[PDB]
Each structure stands twice: as structure tokens, then as C-alpha cells.
Design an enzyme around this catalytic site. Sequence first.
Site, PDB file in Angstrom:
ATOM      1  N   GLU A 169      34.555 -27.819  19.351  1.00 56.94           N
ATOM      2  CA  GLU A 169      33.591 -26.899  19.948  1.00 56.94           C
ATOM      3  C   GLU A 169      32.286 -27.601  20.310  1.00 56.94           C
ATOM      4  O   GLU A 169      31.819 -27.509  21.451  1.00 56.94           O
ATOM      5  CB  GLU A 169      33.331 -25.726  19.001  1.00 56.94           C
ATOM      6  CG  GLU A 169      34.483 -24.730  18.911  1.00 56.94           C
ATOM      7  CD  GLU A 169      34.542 -23.790  20.104  1.00 56.94           C
ATOM      8  OE1 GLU A 169      35.495 -22.987  20.180  1.00 56.94           O
ATOM      9  OE2 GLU A 169      33.636 -23.849  20.962  1.00 56.94           O
TER      10      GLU A 169
ATOM     11  N   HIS B   1      34.071 -27.286  24.338  1.00 61.48           N
ATOM     12  CA  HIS B   1      33.745 -25.868  24.452  1.00 61.48           C
ATOM     13  C   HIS B   1      33.966 -25.346  25.866  1.00 61.48           C
ATOM     14  O   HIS B   1      33.358 -25.831  26.823  1.00 61.48           O
ATOM     15  CB  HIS B   1      32.288 -25.664  24.027  1.00 61.48           C
ATOM     16  CG  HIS B   1      31.820 -24.244  24.095  1.00 61.48           C
ATOM     17  ND1 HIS B   1      32.276 -23.265  23.239  1.00 61.48           N
ATOM     18  CD2 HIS B   1      30.917 -23.644  24.907  1.00 61.48           C
ATOM     19  CE1 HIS B   1      31.682 -22.120  23.527  1.00 61.48           C
ATOM     20  NE2 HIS B   1      30.853 -22.323  24.535  1.00 61.48           N
TER      21      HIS B   1
ATOM     22  N   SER C 228      32.075 -17.761  24.963  1.00 59.59           N
ATOM     23  CA  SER C 228      30.719 -18.216  24.613  1.00 59.59           C
ATOM     24  C   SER C 228      29.823 -16.983  24.519  1.00 59.59           C
ATOM     25  O   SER C 228      30.150 -16.056  23.759  1.00 59.59           O
ATOM     26  CB  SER C 228      30.267 -19.282  25.605  1.00 59.59           C
ATOM     27  OG  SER C 228      28.889 -19.576  25.446  1.00 59.59           O
TER      28      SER C 228
HETATM   29  C1  CVZ Z   1      14.203 -34.466  28.769  1.00 56.29           C
HETATM   30  C2  CVZ Z   1      13.093 -33.715  29.535  1.00 56.29           C
HETATM   31  N1  CVZ Z   1      13.464 -32.273  29.866  1.00 56.29           N
HETATM   32  C3  CVZ Z   1      14.601 -31.764  28.949  1.00 56.29           C
HETATM   33  C4  CVZ Z   1      15.507 -30.630  29.535  1.00 56.29           C
HETATM   34  C5  CVZ Z   1      17.015 -31.005  29.841  1.00 56.29           C
HETATM   35  C6  CVZ Z   1      18.087 -30.427  28.850  1.00 56.29           C
HETATM   36  C7  CVZ Z   1      18.162 -28.863  28.624  1.00 56.29           C
HETATM   37  N2  CVZ Z   1      19.087 -28.369  27.466  1.00 56.29           N
HETATM   38  C8  CVZ Z   1      18.720 -28.568  26.100  1.00 56.29           C
HETATM   39  O1  CVZ Z   1      17.666 -29.137  25.845  1.00 56.29           O
HETATM   40  C9  CVZ Z   1      19.636 -28.076  25.056  1.00 56.29           C
HETATM   41  C10 CVZ Z   1      20.815 -27.442  25.290  1.00 56.29           C
HETATM   42  C11 CVZ Z   1      21.717 -26.957  24.174  1.00 56.29           C
HETATM   43  N3  CVZ Z   1      21.204 -27.216  26.621  1.00 56.29           N
HETATM   44  C12 CVZ Z   1      22.518 -26.529  26.895  1.00 56.29           C
HETATM   45  C13 CVZ Z   1      23.742 -27.484  27.119  1.00 56.29           C
HETATM   46  C14 CVZ Z   1      25.172 -26.973  26.807  1.00 56.29           C
HETATM   47  C15 CVZ Z   1      26.254 -27.405  27.825  1.00 56.29           C
HETATM   48  C16 CVZ Z   1      26.187 -26.685  29.202  1.00 56.29           C
HETATM   49  N4  CVZ Z   1      27.480 -26.159  29.737  1.00 56.29           N
HETATM   50  C17 CVZ Z   1      28.119 -27.019  30.794  1.00 56.29           C
HETATM   51  C18 CVZ Z   1      29.035 -28.063  30.173  1.00 56.29           C
HETATM   52  C19 CVZ Z   1      27.401 -24.715  30.143  1.00 56.29           C
HETATM   53  C20 CVZ Z   1      28.330 -23.728  29.438  1.00 56.29           C
HETATM   54  C21 CVZ Z   1      29.551 -23.429  30.054  1.00 56.29           C
HETATM   55  C22 CVZ Z   1      30.486 -22.554  29.527  1.00 56.29           C
HETATM   56  C23 CVZ Z   1      30.237 -21.914  28.320  1.00 56.29           C
HETATM   57  C24 CVZ Z   1      29.043 -22.168  27.658  1.00 56.29           C
HETATM   58  C25 CVZ Z   1      28.100 -23.057  28.205  1.00 56.29           C
HETATM   59  N5  CVZ Z   1      26.856 -23.233  27.370  1.00 56.29           N
HETATM   60  O2  CVZ Z   1      26.909 -22.896  26.205  1.00 56.29           O
HETATM   61  O3  CVZ Z   1      25.835 -23.686  27.845  1.00 56.29           O
HETATM   62  C26 CVZ Z   1      20.336 -27.697  27.702  1.00 56.29           C
HETATM   63  O4  CVZ Z   1      20.702 -27.498  28.853  1.00 56.29           O
HETATM   64  C27 CVZ Z   1      12.209 -31.431  29.783  1.00 56.29           C
HETATM   65  C28 CVZ Z   1      11.501 -31.078  31.117  1.00 56.29           C
HETATM   66  C29 CVZ Z   1      10.259 -31.644  31.456  1.00 56.29           C
HETATM   67  C30 CVZ Z   1       9.581 -31.355  32.644  1.00 56.29           C
HETATM   68  C31 CVZ Z   1      10.120 -30.467  33.569  1.00 56.29           C
HETATM   69  C32 CVZ Z   1      11.343 -29.877  33.284  1.00 56.29           C
HETATM   70  C33 CVZ Z   1      12.008 -30.180  32.085  1.00 56.29           C
HETATM   71  N6  CVZ Z   1      13.309 -29.496  31.880  1.00 56.29           N
HETATM   72  O5  CVZ Z   1      13.392 -28.611  31.048  1.00 56.29           O
HETATM   73  O6  CVZ Z   1      14.283 -29.815  32.539  1.00 56.29           O
END
Ligand code: CVZ
Lengths: 533, 535
Positions: free
Chosen positions: A324, A437, A199
Site C-alpha cells: 500500500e 496503492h 482510497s
Molecule cells: C518540494 C517543494 N514543494 C513540495 C510539494 C510537492 C509534493 C506534494 N505532496 C506531498 O508533499 C505529500 C503527499 C502525500 N502527496 C501525495 C502523493 C500520493 C501519490 C499520488 N497518486 C498518484 C500516484 C494519486 C492517487 C491515486 C489514486 C488513489 C490515491 C491517490 N492518492 O492517495 O494521492 C503530495 O502530492 C513545495 C512548494 C513550494 C513552492 C510552490 C509550490 C510548492 N508545492 O506545493 O508544489
Amino acid sequence: DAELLVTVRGGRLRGIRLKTPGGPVSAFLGIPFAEPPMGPRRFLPPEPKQPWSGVVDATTFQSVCYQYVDTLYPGFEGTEMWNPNRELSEDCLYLNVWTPYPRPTSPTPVLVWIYGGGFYSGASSLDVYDGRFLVQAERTVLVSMNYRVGAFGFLALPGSREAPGNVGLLDQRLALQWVQENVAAFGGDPTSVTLFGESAGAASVGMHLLSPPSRGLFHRAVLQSGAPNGPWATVGMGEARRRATQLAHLVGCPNDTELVACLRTRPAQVLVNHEWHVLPQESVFRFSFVPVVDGDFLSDTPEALINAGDFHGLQVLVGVVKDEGSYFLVYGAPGFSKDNESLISRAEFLAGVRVGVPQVSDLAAEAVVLHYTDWLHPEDPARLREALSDVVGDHNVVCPVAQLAGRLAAQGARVYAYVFEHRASTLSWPLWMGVPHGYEIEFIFGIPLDPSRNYTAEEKIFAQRLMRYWANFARTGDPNEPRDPKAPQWPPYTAGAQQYVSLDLRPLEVRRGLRAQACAFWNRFLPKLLSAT
Amino acid sequence: DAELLVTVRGGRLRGIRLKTPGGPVSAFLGIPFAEPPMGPRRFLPPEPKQPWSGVVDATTFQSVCYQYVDTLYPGFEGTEMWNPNRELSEDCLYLNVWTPYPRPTSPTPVLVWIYGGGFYSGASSLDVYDGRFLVQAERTVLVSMNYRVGAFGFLALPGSREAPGNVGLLDQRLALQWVQENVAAFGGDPTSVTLFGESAGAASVGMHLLSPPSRGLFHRAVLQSGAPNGPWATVGMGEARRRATQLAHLVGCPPGNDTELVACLRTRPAQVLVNHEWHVLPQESVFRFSFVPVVDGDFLSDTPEALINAGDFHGLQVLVGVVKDEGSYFLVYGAPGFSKDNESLISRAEFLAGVRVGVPQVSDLAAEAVVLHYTDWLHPEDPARLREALSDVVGDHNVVCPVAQLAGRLAAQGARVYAYVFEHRASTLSWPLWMGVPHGYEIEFIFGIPLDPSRNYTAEEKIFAQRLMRYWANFARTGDPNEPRDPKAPQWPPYTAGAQQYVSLDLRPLEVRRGLRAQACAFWNRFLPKLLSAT
Ligand SMILES: CCN(CCC/C=C/n1c(=O)cc(C)n(CCCCCN(CC)Cc2ccccc2[N+](=O)[O-])c1=O)Cc1ccccc1[N+](=O)[O-]
Ligand SMILES: CCN(CCC/C=C/n1c(=O)cc(C)n(CCCCCN(CC)Cc2ccccc2[N+](=O)[O-])c1=O)Cc1ccccc1[N+](=O)[O-]
Ligand SMILES: *[C@@H]1O[C@H](CO[C@H]2O[C@@H](C)[C@@H](O)[C@@H](O)[C@@H]2O)[C@@H](O[C@@H]2O[C@H](CO)[C@@H](O)[C@H](O)[C@H]2NC(C)=O)[C@H](O)[C@H]1NC(C)=O
Ligand SMILES: *[C@@H]1O[C@H](CO[C@H]2O[C@@H](C)[C@@H](O)[C@@H](O)[C@@H]2O)[C@@H](O[C@@H]2O[C@H](CO)[C@@H](O)[C@H](O)[C@H]2NC(C)=O)[C@H](O)[C@H]1NC(C)=O
Ligand SMILES: *[C@@H]1O[C@H](CO)[C@@H](O)[C@H](O[C@@H]2O[C@H](CO)[C@@H](O)[C@H](O)[C@H]2NC(C)=O)[C@H]1NC(C)=O
Ligand SMILES: *[C@@H]1O[C@H](CO)[C@@H](O)[C@H](O)[C@H]1NC(C)=O
Ligand SMILES: [Cl-]
Ligand SMILES: [Cl-]
Ligand SMILES: [Cl-]
Ligand SMILES: [Cl-]
Ligand SMILES: [Cl-]
Ligand SMILES: [Cl-]
Ligand SMILES: [Cl-]
Ligand SMILES: [Cl-]
Ligand SMILES: [Cl-]
Ligand SMILES: [Cl-]
Ligand SMILES: [Cl-]
Ligand SMILES: [Cl-]
Ligand SMILES: [Cl-]
Ligand SMILES: [Cl-]
Ligand SMILES: [Cl-]
Ligand SMILES: [Cl-]
Ligand SMILES: [Cl-]
Ligand SMILES: [Cl-]
Ligand SMILES: [Cl-]
Ligand SMILES: [Cl-]
Ligand SMILES: [Cl-]
Ligand SMILES: [Cl-]
Ligand SMILES: [Cl-]
Ligand SMILES: [Cl-]
Ligand SMILES: [Cl-]
Ligand SMILES: [Cl-]
Ligand SMILES: [Cl-]
Ligand SMILES: [Cl-]
Ligand SMILES: [Cl-]
């Protein structure tokens, strides 16, 4: 005993003996390679760790760099396996070294692992990065570092000396310089250093390929499911400054030097809580603070450096997984969840295209829809779900990798390509996600050999197979066994033939075309369409 | 015999008894349906033939309208078979009628055939259009006509009473009015007329669908390898005048101005205009013709694409289809590296240049999109794939996709539509093997030419043609090709916008397939126009 005490250029260390079913390994966990980048040193390039008195407790992993923690599915192993397993801290610039228990008398080659996480997360202390099995089985030296992620590693006000950006990459480079000066004390060979990452770690590996000051620190590279020419891996100076100033506003901190000095007064957790809020639109597979094309680390865009580059004398191992972009969809795409079949409507699909492909004209989204719609079954939800899973995967991972592999190979490099397509027997994600992925890392690191995990014995054979492929590439630049020319041969990837190998429980199988029809759209046609509308 | 003498509204006619292996047919060849469009009547709409004294020798085919002759491969059968086989003359507005020898007691349906050839060639007197075997084997009245082609039938100075355009289509309409008045004298039912045509003839059929004054002259329609919404079948008023004034320039006619320009054209001999026909085309092209129907606001109230989306189509049976290799043989008329004698294994550099000659007057970005969809990016250099690919480019862009577009809109607006794909290569085929089943080589089997003893068709090609004639005749009678009460037969399902079902026509029985090159036509019919209006 006496194998667990070693002395590097900065002081004395005390390691720990780790147990493998096939023997023991000597491990030195949490070796400091930089002075803690805290206070005035936040956002700054790292300083080499000054020598220390006494011995350092190198028997356990040090802290995880401050990062956002996934909480979408609490207690769900598919997400928790990537979350931090140590305390968060800005005092996190530490590295680890695994070496065989009878410390190698002759200089053995070195694998250096750079983790992924969209430059916003990740830690060398994760369980799937455990390198005891990869060392015990193949008798190499494995090194893994921590590098600053998020705004702490990639916030940039380009031009200013206080927020210069790409300091997480400079963390990696400093760790590589440490390996050049100190891996010899563990048996490592500073003249056979092979970088491998997944990644953002794979994209990071691609950065060091295109950065001259890093080029003399390693000899061959492995890029697993990542490339620096991806749409998510780099950002321009204009947008980088926009995202940094947006963060200072959200946190109460709004010239340039005034802006940074205020940001250093905020607690690290306060910045982390506003990370995802600086992105220009609702998107998936986009991250806030990534490497910036500024003219220092990257003389040009990664795309430009790739084309004009000469890569003779370079051996490269690249590849992707079967599905992916499957689990990215459950993080914002309409109608998707890990807990149902995600059989989406076409209206949900057309809406999801704009999320997977953000900052793109209406006409170009039409071009994406035309290519990924089955116009005999335009409404079938199952086909529509797999289609968007292909849109995100091809646009972000597959086609960036295929573009890099063809350019490297056709410009001097010797490239070997794969497609990991074995779904683990332990996979906790839904079945429609396939091989998502990052779920080849367990086998690359020989995690199935861990007795406490219930992998099938046939999967243990698969792991030892992949471990030999990687070690063979590390030693020779060729994944094939020069011992056995009866086994199916892994041919080099070339721009014309486009040969790659499928990695699963079956023996090796040579296939042609790394999604060649789809990637012609992303790499060739779509740029022309945007440049004309 | 008594059957070879009949009185039409204009006078009397003397016919011929024609011989078929299964029996005889009466035929009346060379019936004048219009006053000769000569001298000052050149470029003008036709006038009804004035009644005549005595009998008319309706025993032999009349002349062929003045047209270009394909001198590209002298003596080659596949080329010469479409070239005119009668004397060339502007006095060509005649038609022919076939009827069974036991003249039908009951009103029988009528099949009206319109020949093709890019509106620049064609004639009803061709051997492939012989109506004996179709009328004998199925006992329907068949009618064919000659309409003016080239500049003689489609030179247009929009807005002038001297060259109003589409007079070749007005020739066809006048023949249909003649059928309405007179086909009853041969056993034909004026209330059951089915139009069927191929290439520009099929495009003409679809234009009679979109022109109201023609709508009361037939009830069913068959479009074979052609559609009125093709990129080659129509032309704009501005481009039509631009092409016609250039023709006047190229024959030394100094450019009211329009009245002078046409009068000078009326003086130049007919062959001189034909010699400079292909020179008014705007650039290097294939499957593109100089003088075609014009969207002038009279015969075509709007563009055929517009008239098709909001039309009067409910209660209309339409038969529609294409051949497997629609665009193959066009390529030898201008695409680099193509020849009938060669194997035409072109280089990629020739493929890219041939794309811009098969798809002319498009932006460079549009051509790039065509290359993207039709290249095999796993084998982008293979000359064998590049050859078939450019065939598909011309075949889809000009025939398949316009035809699929027509069938969809007709079905969605209430038309009973049946779609086919003709994929049998004739054993007698004079064209090379890589051309497959080329544009136009289903006509021989629809007309039952395999039944001619002087031809060396297979015994199975004979039962094939008898099955196709059955399909076409069943459609002309009922509006449904398959047999009325047939238990054991692969049923031919109607074409719909959703299921998109069609059948394959070859020696094997009816195989029902879905999707008429749907993935390819989505590019041509949907995305390409968006990209063209956004650059
Ligand atoms: C709905 C309300 N909320 C939304 C935030 C929650 C989601 C965050 N979000 C995204 O929107 C978009 C993306 C692409 N993603 C990354 C996810 C990818 C997978 C992670 N994966 C582990 C399987 C890891 C990994 C592992 C190995 C290799 C590569 C990767 N990799 O590539 O990541 C996200 O996380 C807003 C808010 C409002 C008030 C206070 C705080 C917040 N607040 O913000 O929480
Ligand atoms: C097997 C028999 N088939 C005929 C095949 C049809 C192929 C199209 N075809 C021709 O037939 C003849 C010719 C000469 N050409 C080439 C003309 C274009 C080149 C003009 N080029 C010169 C630079 C541009 C230019 C010119 C002048 C000045 C300046 C410029 N400029 O600006 O460059 C063709 O393409 C009849 C048929 C039978 C049944 C059903 C349908 C058909 N049927 O026909 O479909
Ligand atoms: C499949 O799941 C998605 C995901 O959303 C929901 O899934 C449920 C199992 C439940 O746990 C719920 O809490 C979770 O959010 C469904 O889409 C959702 O539909 C609901 C309405 O029922 C909306 O309120 C949500 O906003 C919407 N989520 C998104 C991301 O659009 C979906 O309906 C479900 N079924 C199918 C066939 O896809
Ligand atoms: C395939 O054939 C075409 C043309 O076919 C014929 O052309 C005649 C001139 C004659 O030679 C006959 O034997 C031949 O089969 C070839 O196209 C032409 O090739 C010549 C050779 O250099 C060029 O000078 C012409 O420009 C070219 N015409 C074009 C490009 O329109 C073609 O080369 C041939 N391919 C082969 C043999 O591989
Ligand atoms: C940026 O920060 C404030 C914003 O108004 C501005 O005064 C700075 O100028 C001062 O410049 C001095 C010259 O080096 C420096 O000694 C001083 O520390 C600095 N003030 C502060 C509060 O840092 C601007 N600095 C620039 C433009 O370099
Ligand atoms: C399977 O593995 C889990 C955790 O990895 C463990 O709790 C469980 O006991 C294992 N199953 C068996 C049968 O050992
Ligand atoms: Cl342990
Ligand atoms: Cl000391
Ligand atoms: Cl769960
Ligand atoms: Cl050793
Ligand atoms: Cl400054
Ligand atoms: Cl440095
Ligand atoms: Cl880039
Ligand atoms: Cl270039
Ligand atoms: Cl837009
Ligand atoms: Cl559907
Ligand atoms: Cl289905
Ligand atoms: Cl080499
Ligand atoms: Cl499941
Ligand atoms: Cl393959
Ligand atoms: Cl593909
Ligand atoms: Cl290109
Ligand atoms: Cl005869
Ligand atoms: Cl007369
Ligand atoms: Cl008389
Ligand atoms: Cl006008
Ligand atoms: Cl009607
Ligand atoms: Cl014009
Ligand atoms: Cl087909
Ligand atoms: Cl090839
Ligand atoms: Cl092949
Ligand atoms: Cl194929
Ligand atoms: Cl041949
Ligand atoms: Cl049936
Ligand atoms: Cl298709």
C-alpha cells in the site's frame, strides 16, 4: 439511433455508443446533477440542478474539479494516469451512466463508483474508471460522479453557515439521490445500489455507512484500500479551522463570514497553489482538506460510530493491495526515489518514521521502530525500505481496513475480505514498489480487455474473474458463484478467524490474519500509549 | 592411601577415594573455610576458620544452610532433587575439593562451582553437583562451597554494622580466597580458576565479575541460565530495608532502632525466619525471591546494569547460555491454571492475570505492551499457545534477555564470549512434557551424571555428557570450548554484539545459530525501560 436518447426528471439527454470487444454499451457522460457551485456557492452545499430545455450533449466527460496536479515525474505514466484529463473548472458537478446496449427490460442492479485521491484530487473521467467493460461483461448499470475535492469540497470553518465542510461528501449524496430518482430510466434498479470506491473513495463509502441521511440511498458497500477511520481521512474542528485560516492568511484574505467572503474572491487556481502549505508538518499520506468531524454528517468520530453501530442487514466487500504505502515514500521520505533501488540508511529510516507517522511522541516513534526493526539486521537497507513501506501502508490503509472489517462483521454485517497481489505486466513504477496503492482498479474495471493495451491474455481472464466477483457481490452480497461450489470458496471475514482471499493469477487461496500482529500495535496498543504520555 | 591425606594451611585433612566407572578420584568433603556464623554472628560477614588441632574428617558432606524446603509435591523427584539432602544448620560454611587420584604432577586448572536456587536454597552436597565424573574424565580440580541463603545470607539493613547485606556473597569470596591459598595442595593452579554456576549461582558469578575485590580470585567465568542484571537478582537499599523490617514485624520483633531490630532477629529460631520468608515479597510473584544481593555501594558499587556498561572486561573469557524452556516450570508456583500433573491449558483471562504475576511492579501500560508482543493475535484464545507464551514471558524477562544483554556488553568491551542454548530433554525427566527442557536440567549433563551406573540414561546421553564436560574443561584450560587443533568439527564461534552467534547443545552436532531471541529481548532490554520511565 433511438437507444441513445433518454429523458430524466430534469430534461432530455443524448448519449453515445461505446465499443467493447464483446459488444456495444450505451453511455451518458457528463450529466449535470447540481447547479454549478460557483461564486457565492463556493464552499457551500450543492443545489439540485434545475430542469433544462432541449437536450444535453451527454457524449463526453465534463470538466474536472479544480485540484493540484502531480508534477514530480513529468510525462511518467505512473503519475499521469491519475492527473486530470479534462479542463479544470468549478463547474464540475456532473455524473455518468453506463448501461448495456439492449437497454435492460428488467431492473438490473447498479454499481456506483466514488473515486479516490486523498480528497484533494481525482476525476470520474480517468481512463482506469472506464466502465464499458464492466457493464458489457456483467450487464449492470454503472454510475460515477464528480465531487468537489480540496478546499473547494472540504474547507471548513465549523459552526459558520458559509464554510460548513463536508460538501464534497454532500456532492456524492446528491448524486446518490439522483440515482434513486433517475437510474430507472436507464434500466437500473434503485433497490440494488452497491457503492464501491478506492482510497478516499473507499473512505467516502465508509462515511455514507455511518451517515443516516445517506444510508437509505444504497444497499451494500465495497471499500477498496480505504476506510473512514484512517488517520488521514478525518480532521477535528480545531485543526480544520486552523488549516482554513492558515489558507486565508497565505492567500491575503484574513470574523468567519468575513474570512469566507474574501476567499470566494480569489481565483480557484490561487487557492490550489497554496494547498500543501497548510499542513502542520512535513508528512506523507496526509492531505490538507478532508472530511471534518463536526456533528452533522458524522454524529461522532468514524471510530465511535463504528463501535456503537448496528450493521445487521449489511453486506461489505473490503480489501487492500500487497504494497500500500510503497510509492507514497517517494513524495518526501529521505533516500527514496522511483528511479533507484531506494536502499536507505537506518538514519534515513528513523527519520522516515517521523514523516510516515506525524504528530506523534518520541516514545511512540520508538514503539514503531521497535516493532518494524529486524534487530538481527538493523542496518540492512533492503529490509529497512520494506519496513518503512509497511509502516506507511499498515498505519494508513491496512490496519484501518482490518479494524473496520472486524467491527462490522462482529456487529451484524456480512464481510468479505481480499488482498490484491498481482503486479500488472504494464506497471511503470519500479519493481521494489511491488503492487502499489490503487493498481487493482484496472482489473476491477476490466481495462485489460481494451485491445489497445498490451495486457497478457491471462490477465484478461483475471480481469473477467474480478469483474464477476464484484458483480456477484453487487447482485447478491456474496462474491462467490452460487453456480459452482467446486471452485475455491471465498469465506466471510470474521473477527476471530479473520479469513480473506488472495487475488492474483492463481486460483483463490484462503489466508488467515490481515497483518494481525502489526495491526494489534496500531489499533490496540498505540492509542493506549498516546493516551498515557 | 597416601593421596587421601593432605595438609591445608589451617590443618590436616582426611579424604575419601571415590569410585567412577573410568577410575578413582580423591575428594575432601566438609572442609571448614569459615568460623560458624551463629548466634551473634548471624547476618554478619564471615570470618576465616581458625586453625585446628589434629586432623579433620573431610570424608562426608557437611550440613546445609538453613533454607525453605519445597513441600509442594511431596516425594516428586523433580522437586525433591533440589531439596537439602543433609541436616539443616547455620553451621554450614564448608567447602569440598575433588582431584584426580593420580594427583596431578603439573599445576592444573580449577573449576569452582556455585549453586543456584534464587539465593534462598541450594547446597554443594546435592547429587547433581557430584564432582567425580567431571574430575576423572577431564582431570581438573573442582571446588564447591556452601554459602548462606535466604535472610541468613542476604537480610540487609543498609547502613548498619549489624546487617550489612550480601554476606552470602562474602561467604563465596572467602571460599575463593581459600582456593587461592590452598588449591595448590591438591594440584590446582591458583592462576587458572574458572567460575561456573547456574541460576542464582550464575548471577553470583557475574557479580564477582563486577566486584573488584573478587576479580583477583579467578580468570574465567561461566554463567548458566543466570545473570547479575536480572530483575530478580538484585534489590535496592530502600526495598531491602523495607523487606527486612517487615520480616522483623512478622516474627514479633518490635521495630538505635536498627541495632535493636537485628538483635531481636538474632534471638528468633532459624526455622521461624524461614516460615515467614515469602511474606515480605511486595505482591504476588513468580521468579521473584525475598532476600537477594543488595545494591548497597559496597559489594556492588552501582546497579549491575550500570557496572556492566562501563567495566573492566578486556582479556576475559566468558561462557554463557540458557536452556530452551527457561520459564516453564516456574509457572506452577503461582500462575493461574498451571500444574505439573495438569496440561495447564489456561484461558486468556488467566493469561492476562498470569502476565501481571510474572511481570510484577510494572505499570498497567507496561503489562499491555507485554500482552501485545507475546499474544498471537491470529489465535489469541488458543490455550496451548497461551501456555507457551507465558513461559516465554517469564523465560525471557528473567533469564534469556538479561543473559543476552550481559553477553553483548562483555563482547563490546573486549571479552571473548561463547554462547550456547541447551535444548536436550533428559529421558529421565520427571517433569511433564509441555515443560520441555526446564530451568536447571543441563546441570546433570555438565557434571557427567549420565555416567553413574545406578542411573538409566541413554547410551547417547553418555556420549553427550562426555562432550559437554569436554567443552567446559577445554574452556577452563584455554578459554575456548572447541578442540584446539580440530579440522572436522563444527567450530563454535565466539558471541559478538553484531553477529550474535551461539550454538545449540543436544545429541545432534553443533548447530550455529544467530540471534538469542533478539526480537523479544529488544522489547525487554530497550523499549520497556523507556516506557517505564515515561509513565
Ligand atoms: C518540494 C517543494 N514543494 C513540495 C510539494 C510537492 C509534493 C506534494 N505532496 C506531498 O508533499 C505529500 C503527499 C502525500 N502527496 C501525495 C502523493 C500520493 C501519490 C499520488 N497518486 C498518484 C500516484 C494519486 C492517487 C491515486 C489514486 C488513489 C490515491 C491517490 N492518492 O492517495 O494521492 C503530495 O502530492 C513545495 C512548494 C513550494 C513552492 C510552490 C509550490 C510548492 N508545492 O506545493 O508544489
Ligand atoms: C525445582 C525447584 N526450584 C524451585 C522453583 C522456584 C519458583 C519460585 N517460588 C518458590 O520456589 C516458592 C514459593 C512459595 N513461591 C510463591 C511465593 C509468592 C506469593 C506471595 N503473595 C501472596 C498473595 C504476595 C504477598 C505475600 C505476603 C503478604 C502480602 C502479599 N501481597 O501483598 O499480596 C515461588 O514463587 C529450585 C531451583 C533449583 C535449581 C536452580 C534454580 C532453582 N530456583 O529456585 O530457581
Ligand atoms: C537514490 O535516490 C535518492 C533520491 O534523490 C535523487 O535520486 C537521484 C537518482 C537523482 O535523480 C536526484 O536528482 C534525486 O533527487 C537519493 O537521495 C538524494 O541524495 C542526494 C545526494 O546525492 C540529495 O541531494 C537529495 O536530497 C536526496 N534526496 C532525498 C529525498 O533525500 C539517494 O542518494 C539515491 N541513492 C540511494 C542509495 O538511496
Ligand atoms: C489444571 O490444574 C490446576 C491445578 O492442578 C491441580 O489442582 C489441585 C487443586 C487438584 O485439583 C489437582 O487434581 C489439579 O491437577 C487447576 O487450577 C485450579 O483449578 C481449581 C478447579 O476449579 C480451582 O478451584 C483453583 O482455583 C485453580 N487454581 C488456580 C487457578 O490457581 C486448573 O483448573 C486445571 N485446569 C484444567 C483441569 O483444565
Ligand atoms: C462578520 O463579518 C464582519 C467582520 O467585522 C462583521 O461586521 C459581520 O457583521 C455584519 O453583520 C450584519 C448582521 O447580519 C450583516 O448584515 C452584515 O452583512 C455583516 N457584515 C459583513 C461585512 O458581512 C460579521 N457577521 C456575522 C458575525 O454574522
Ligand atoms: C504496447 O502498448 C503501447 C501503448 O499502450 C503501444 O504504443 C504499443 O504499440 C504496444 N505494443 C505492441 C507490440 O502493440
Ligand atoms: Cl471509443
Ligand atoms: Cl423542450
Ligand atoms: Cl519516466
Ligand atoms: Cl434483460
Ligand atoms: Cl457566522
Ligand atoms: Cl440532503
Ligand atoms: Cl476515526
Ligand atoms: Cl467498545
Ligand atoms: Cl515528545
Ligand atoms: Cl545488518
Ligand atoms: Cl542478509
Ligand atoms: Cl448474516
Ligand atoms: Cl526496476
Ligand atoms: Cl495463512
Ligand atoms: Cl503481521
Ligand atoms: Cl483493547
Ligand atoms: Cl558411592
Ligand atoms: Cl574444627
Ligand atoms: Cl597436632
Ligand atoms: Cl538505607
Ligand atoms: Cl581477569
Ligand atoms: Cl521500598
Ligand atoms: Cl530458544
Ligand atoms: Cl483461537
Ligand atoms: Cl492452528
Ligand atoms: Cl505458529
Ligand atoms: Cl507427562
Ligand atoms: Cl567448521
Ligand atoms: Cl525473537
